[PDB]
Structures are given as C-alpha cells and as structure tokens.
Amino acid sequence: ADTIVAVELDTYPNTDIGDPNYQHIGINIKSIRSKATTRWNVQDGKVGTAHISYNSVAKRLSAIVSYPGGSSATVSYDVDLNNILPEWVRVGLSASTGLYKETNTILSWSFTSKLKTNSTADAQSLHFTFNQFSQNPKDLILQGDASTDSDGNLQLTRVSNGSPQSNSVGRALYYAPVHVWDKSAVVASFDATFTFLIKSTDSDIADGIAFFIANTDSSIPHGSGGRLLGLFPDAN
C-alpha cells in the first residue's frame, strides 16, 4: 500500500512531471501524475469553493471548483475506491508553496461519510463542518506549517504580516478516523466541501491546495514540498 487519493487544485504547471501546460484541477490516485485533469483558472484574491463527491455504487469520483461569477471547472475519474483505500482512513487538506508563493487559506470545510448497508438508516456515519477555525483546533491534526490565524481561518501554509512565504508545507486532518468501508457494507459514500483563498502580490504563484484521503497514521512525506503538495515523496 500507502495510499493517497486526493483532489488537487494545481496552481503551477510542472510539464516535466506530467502537469498540463496551464493551471489546472486534477484527480490523484496514488501518484502526483493526475489520473484526470481539467483546465482551471486561479483568480488571485477571491474566495473559491470546492465540492467533492464519490459514491461506491456509481464509482465516479468527481470534483468541481468554483469562483463566484459562474466561472467553474469540473473533473471526474472513474475508479473503485474500495480496492484502493483501506477500510479506515483520515481525511484532510494540505498545501505547499515553492520558490513562488501564495496564501493557501481555508475559510471553511465540510465532510460527510456514510456507511449504510441494509435495513436502511445508518450503520455508521460522520459529518463535520467548520465555518470558523478555533485558535486551538483540538479536533484537527495540524502538520507542518499549518496553523489557524486570528481571523478564524486555517492557514495551511505560512503567512507573515499579510505576506505568504516560500517553501512552506502544511496539512490538516480531521482528528477522528473514518470508516470508509466494511465487508458487510452495501453502499459507501463521502462528500467534501471547503472554501479557499489563494492570493499573492506576484502573478506567478505556486503550488496549490489539495483535499486528501489517506491511512490513519499518514504524515507529511519527505520530498513533499513545492509541487508534491505535501502528498507524495516522489513524482512517480
């Protein structure tokens, strides 16, 4: 194993590691080389939204990221996550800056998980929403440079005096592990939404924000930085 399924909001195109030659939105399955991508357009300074969906029966993993004004992108891949993921996982959001930098601010985050089966209702389920983040988020595993600011926002990557910083990595995970699958399960599904703010003084920006599902114990790998988005140790 050692596993990651992520949805990447990729803000710098490294054509050498199979990024398309433009800012994009992608689906990652065990590799940084996105299994599917669509054209995205960052809009420096604006609050964006990301909606992610998967359903064990339809087996389509789809995401959509939107800025107000109608300008939005969708991508979906098409994969049986029962076979990829472990039964228990932790969900999270992570982000990185490179030589080029940006704010990777999360203003809000929601997530639903259902393990229904039979005789209906719910064998197991989880829901959390955060619309403000506590100064001391006791239900989040903060990793690397991930902090909450005095605004009740989650700064995945470092920010000094209104300014982003180079070579930063932050991840935040939901404290509780999530039972994404069981042998006796009929359906499994999850839905995740988060709002983000990517801003910088420069027009050149790096490297992106991603939402990820991983193993319970998962921590920031080794060559995680820049364009590995805190997710993978190599570009394979």
Which residues bind to its own copies, rule: CB under 8 A? 47-49, 51, 53, 55, 57-58, 60-64, 66-69, 72, 74, 76, 87-88, 108-110, 116-132, 134, 138-139, 152, 174-179, 182, 184, 186-187, 189, 191, 193-195, 216
Binding of residue 227 to Ca ion (CB under 5 A): yes
Instruction: Name residue 54's amino acid.
Output: Y
Looking at 19-27, 52-60, 131-139, 142-150, which segment touches Ca ion (CB under 5 A)? 19-27
Q: Are strands 147-148 and 154-155 parallel, antiparallel or unpaired?
A: antiparallel
Cβ closer to its own copies: 39 or 60? 60
Burial class (CB in 10 A: 0-12, 13-18, 19+), 16: exposed
Find out whether 8 is annotated in a ligand binding site: yes
Find out whether 34 is annotated in a ligand binding site: yes
- Residue 26 binds what, of Ca ion, its own copies, Mn ion, none (CB under 5 to 8 Å, by partner type)? Mn ion
Find out whether 191 is annotated in a ligand binding site: no
Looking at 108-116, 140-148, 180-188, 227-235, which segment touches Ca ion (CB under 5 A)? 227-235
Give 34-99 as a 3 state SS string.
CCEEEECCCCCCCEEEEEEEEECCCCEEEEEEECCCCCEEEEEEECCHHHHCCCEEEEEEEEECCC
Cβ closer to its own copies: 126 or 159? 126
Rounded to 5 degrees, what are φ and ψ at 81?
A: -70, -15
**Cβ(28)–Cβ(19) under 8 Å?**
no
CB neighbourhood size of 180 (10 A): 25
Binding site for Mn ion (CB under 5 A): 10, 19, 26, 34
Binding-site sequence positions for a carbohydrate: 12, 99-100, 227
